[PDB]
């Protein structure tokens, strides 16, 4: 778990959310089309975990966002003047011209 990896973990969370719609619409459908209280007991029993796991997953990922201690405000960059790769790059072209 580092840098981008948590973001990828968030990708795992991403698939779950939209379905929460149809699942609810599935639950009602059990008392609707299926006309069955028991199957509604089932899918309603399933439906809540989509809520709980995602909610707790967010609260915990955010807690990770605090543990990482990434600053609340983006830093203003200095006008970077001479990272080495830029230097030996330009030098490389210099020899390339020579």
């Amino acid at each position: 778990s580092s840098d981008t990896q948590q973001v990828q973990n968030i990708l795992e969370l991403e698939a779950k959310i939209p379905d929460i719609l149809s699942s609810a619409g599935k639950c009602i459908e059990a008392i609707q089309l299926n006309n069955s209280l028991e199957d509604f007991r089932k899918y309603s029993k399933e439906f809540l975990e989509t809520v709980e796991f995602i909610s707790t997953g967010l609260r915990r990922q955010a807690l990770e966002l605090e543990k990482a201690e990434v600053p609340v405000v983006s830093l203003q960059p200095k006008k970077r003047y001479a990272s080495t790769p830029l230097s030996n790059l330009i030098f490389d072209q210099s020899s390339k011209l020579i």
Binding site: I17, G25, I28, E29
Partner: protein, 50 residues
């Protein structure tokens, strides 16, 4: 000047049975609209995730 209206104690009066059918017909359509709504929203949100 107001107070034109005045009390009149006269019957509930009564209601047609078909209205009871309307009570069902409205609600069932509303529920179907509910399911279609949730499903459609899942669709467009799935595309948004895409």
């Amino acid at each position: 000047p107001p107070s034109s209206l005045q009390f009149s104690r006269s019957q509930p009066p009564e209601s047609k049975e078909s209205d009871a059918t309307l009570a069902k017909c409205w609600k069932e359509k509303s529920l179907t609209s509910s399911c279609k709504f949730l499903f459609e929203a899942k669709e467009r949100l799935t595309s948004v995730v895409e």
